[PDB]
């Protein structure tokens, strides 16, 4: 048994830990606000209807 066989090759990924996701989190909050606004418009339309005209 005399070929050079490489068993434990290092992986591409670096040893560091996961980077923080604060900016991504704020942008997701912005998308959530935009999505909330369109449903809020429907409920607000329901809010402006007259009182006792059922």
């Amino acid at each position: 048994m005399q070929p050079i066989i490489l068993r434990t090759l290092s992986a591409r990924r670096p040893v560091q830990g996961r980077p923080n996701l604060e900016t991504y989190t704020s942008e997701v909050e912005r998308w959530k606000a935009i999505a909330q606004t369109q449903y809020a418009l429907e409920l607000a339309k329901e809010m402006s209807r007259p009182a006792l005209r059922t």
Binding site: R30, A33, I34, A40, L41, L43, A44, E46, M47
Partner: protein, 160 residues
């Protein structure tokens, strides 16, 4: 109305309408078609103006819809957009009526202490109203934009 204000001044002084009051009323009646045009443009685009105003105000102040914010939640954001729609409708009323009375009796008397009790941040309301003003001026010509901006700025000033 301009007519109501003039007649109330005459009545409080127990006199007929003066030449100046008559000229005021004549000017208002002459401006009527321009007022109706501006008000019609604002009324036809209420949804767009309010949707854009809410977008701009929440973008400038994300804390309002963040947890712990005044408008946080579906019902509270609905009430906020509903208030913006209310103020736009009142601005159309002021434009048609030629004075600020409809905006006063319907929406500005007591709004300050109302928003104070509910901890509604008035700078955020002013931001939403300025956003609505810009959305509106986008739809109106420069002269119509100036006319509507008179009442928008009145609402802004009365909030502060």
């Amino acid at each position: 109305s301009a007519i109501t204000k003039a007649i109330l001044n005459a009545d409080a002084e127990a006199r007929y309408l003066s030449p100046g009051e008559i000229d005021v009323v004549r000017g208002y009646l002459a401006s009527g078609e321009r007022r109706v045009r501006v008000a019609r443009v604002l009324s036809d685009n209420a949804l767009r103006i309010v949707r854009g105003a809410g977008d701009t105000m929440f973008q400038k102040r994300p804390d309002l819809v963040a947890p712990g914010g005044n408008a946080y939640g579906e019902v509270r954001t609905a009430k906020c957009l509903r208030d913006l729609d209310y103020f736009l409708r009142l601005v159309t009323y002021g434009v048609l009526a030629g004075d600020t009375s409809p905006i006063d009796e319907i929406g500005l008397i007591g709004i300050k202490e109302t928003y104070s009790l509910l901890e509604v941040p008035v700078p955020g309301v002013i931001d939403g109203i300025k956003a609505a003003k810009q959305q509106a001026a986008a739809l109106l010509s420069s002269e119509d934009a100036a006319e509507a901006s008179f009442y928008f700025d009145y609402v802004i000033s009365a909030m502060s």
